[PDB]
C-alpha cells in the first residue's frame, strides 16, 4: 500500500491539532497541549485507491528542516479570524520551497475555524493568495468537521499529480 | 582533502579583495587594484575537518556562478547602494545555478567605521528572508573575517 | 527521528521472516507462515544516532514488487548457506533492484543465513567474492542463535547513511 507523508504547518492556535485528530479519529478535541508534536496514521480510500496517510502535526530549526525534507505535501493552515496567521503563510511557503529546493512542492492552503462569525480574513483574499501559488484553497472547521476530509484528500491528489 | 570553491561578490569598493586577502594571508591591503580578478587557495581546519578553500575574488560571471559552491554576498555598512545591490546578486545566483537553496552568507563589511548608513536590523531581516546567515566584518581589523568564510563552508557542508 | 525503509529479499525458506522477527522482537520463530508479507518498526541506536527502522519482510519472490523496491532505501539480500540455488538467485535480486531504482549504487548488504547448520554448500570465500564484486558488505547470520542479526541490519543502515 502506497503511503504519503503529510505535514500540517501554521501559526500557534490555528487548529493544526484539531484538524489532524478530526481526520484521524473523527474526534473533536477542544484542548490539546500546544507543545505536543506527534505523527498519526490512517488508511483511507481516495479516488478508488487505498493509501496510508502518515500525518505530522507540528508544534513549535534543524529538526524543522528535517521534517520538511521528508514530508511530501504540506497543509498550510491559518485561522479565518486571525489575520496574522494568514500573513504568516508566505513564510511557511518560502521555507518549504527553499528546504525542498522546489518551486512545485505539493501544498494546500487551509482556512480553518469557518464555523466562527468573527471573520477577519476575506475568502477572496485567501483565494487570491492560493491562486498566486497555484495551489488549492479549502475552508475548514475542525469543530464541525466541514472540509476536513477535503483538505487532506486534496493534498493527496496534489502529491499524486506531482508524481 | 575536500576542496570548496567560494565566490566573493558585491559592489565595487565594499571590500571583496581586502576580505579575501585577510582570510588567505592574514594581511590587510589598503588599496588593491579594483580590476584584478584572481583566485587563491588556503588549507584550513573547520569543525575538526581539514579542507582546501579555493576563493574567487570577483572584479563570464555565469561560468563562475555555476562552478562556485558557495557565495559571500558583501556590502559595506556605510554604502546603502551596495546593500540595495545584494538582492540582484541573490537573484542572479539563484537563476544561474537553478536552485532556491544556494549556500550563501550575507556580509556587512567595514564595521570599524563610524559612518554607518545600513542598520544591523535591516541586514538581519534581509538574511532572515533568504534563510542565510548574516555576519558583520572588518577586513581592516580582521574582526569576523574567518567567521564569514567558515560559516559559508558550514552552509555548503549542510547542503551536501 | 530519522526513519529508514529496509527491504528483506531472498528465496523462499532462506530465513527472511526469522531474521526480521529476531531483529524486531529478539525472538526466534521456527515456523512462520511463508505467505505473510508484513512490515515492522523498531527504534534503535546506531553509532550514537537514534533512528526508526521500518522493515518490510517480503513473501512472494510484479507491480507491487516494483513499488516496494522504489520505496525501499536499502535491501538485505538473503541466501541460506546450505542452499546453493538461493545464492545463485542473488544476482537476479541485485539486477532487479538496480533496474527498478535506476541506480548502480543502491544500499545493499549480502546476508548468508543459517550459519549454525552443518550442511554448508556455499563457501564463505565464495560469498565474500560476490559481495566484493558488488562493492557491498557480506554478513553471515543465524536467525536461530541471533548471531550477526543486528550486524546485518545496522550495517545496512550505515550503507544508507554513507550513500546520503
Ligand atoms: O509506500 C509504501 N510503503 C510501504 C512500506 C512500509 C510501511 N510503512 C508504514 C508506515 C510507518 C510510519 C513510521 C512513522 N513515521 C513518522 C513520520 N511521519 C511523518 C509525516 C510527515 C513528515 C515526517 C514524518 C515522520 C518522520 N520520519 C522522519 O524521517 C522524520 C524526521 C523528522 C521528524 O520530525 C519526523 C519524521 N514499510 C516499508 C519498508 C520497506 C519498503 C516499503 C515499506 C509499502 C509496502 C509496499 O509493499 C508497497 C508500497 C509501500
Ligand atoms: O576534493 C578533492 N579535491 C582533490 C583533487 C585535486 C586538488 N585540487 C586542488 C587545486 C585547485 C585548483 C585551482 C584552480 N581553481 C580556480 C578557481 N577557483 C574558483 C573559485 C570559485 C569559482 C571558480 C573558481 C575557479 C575557476 N574554475 C572554473 O571552472 C572557472 C571559471 C571561471 C572563473 O572566473 C574561474 C574559474 N585535484 C584532483 C584531481 C582529480 C580528483 C581530485 C582532485 C582531492 C583529492 C583526493 O585524493 C580526495 C579528494 C579531493
Ligand atoms: N470554533 C473553532 N475552534 C477551533 C477550530 N479548530 C481549532 N479550534 C480551537 O482553537 C484552539 C487551538 O486549536 P489547536 O488544535 O490546539 O491549534 P494548534 O495550536 O494549531 O495545534 C483550540 O481551543 C481549539 O479547540 C475550529 O474549526 N473552530
Ligand atoms: N575601514 C575599512 N576600510 C576597508 C575595509 N575593507 C576594505 N576597506 C577599504 O575600502 C576600499 C576598497 O576595498 P577593496 O578590497 O579594494 O574593495 P573591492 O572593490 O570590493 O575589492 C579600500 O581602500 C580598502 O582598504 C574595512 O573593513 N574597513
Ligand atoms: N537452523 C536455522 N534455521 C533457520 C534459520 N533461519 C530460518 N530458519 C528456519 O528455516 C525455515 C524458513 O524460515 P523463514 O523465516 O520462514 O524463511 P522465509 O521464507 O525466507 O521467510 C523456518 O523453519 C525457520 O525456522 C537459521 O539461521 N538457522
Ligand atoms: Mg497543536
Ligand atoms: Mg577587488
Ligand atoms: Mg516469510
UniProtKB/Swiss-Prot annotation, chain C:
Result of changing residue 59 to T: In GASC; also found in bladder cancer; somatic mutation
UniProt xrefs under SUPFAM superfamilies: P-loop containing nucleoside triphosphate hydrolases (SSF52540)
GO BP, sorted A to Z: actin cytoskeleton organization; cardiac muscle cell proliferation; cytokine-mediated signaling pathway; epithelial tube branching involved in lung morphogenesis; female pregnancy; forebrain astrocyte development; gene expression; glial cell proliferation
This enzyme's EC code(s): 3.6.5.2
Cross-referenced InterPro entries: P-loop_NTPase, Small_GTP-bd, Small_GTPase, Small_GTPase_Ras-type
Effect of substituting residue 22 to E: In CFC2; exhibits an increase in intrinsic and guanine nucleotide exchange factor catalyzed nucleotide exchange in combination with an impaired GTPase-activating protein-stimulated GTP hydrolysis but functional in interaction with effectors
Glycosylated position list: 35
Entry keyword annotation includes Cytoplasm: yes
Effect noted on mutating residue 14 to I: In NS3; affects activity and impairs responsiveness to GTPase activating proteins; characterized by a strong increase of both intrinsic and guanine nucleotide exchanged factor-catalyzed nucleotide exchange leading to an increased level of the activated state
Record's bilayer topology term: Lipid-anchor
Recorded consequence of changing residue 114 to N: In colorectal cancer samples; somatic mutation
Functional description taken from the UniProt entry: Ras proteins bind GDP/GTP and possess intrinsic GTPase activity. Plays an important role in the regulation of cell proliferation. Plays a role in promoting oncogenic events by inducing transcriptional silencing of tumor suppressor genes (TSGs) in colorectal cancer (CRC) cells in a ZNF304-dependent manner.
Protein name in the entry: GTPase KRas
Organism for this UniProt entry: Homo sapiens
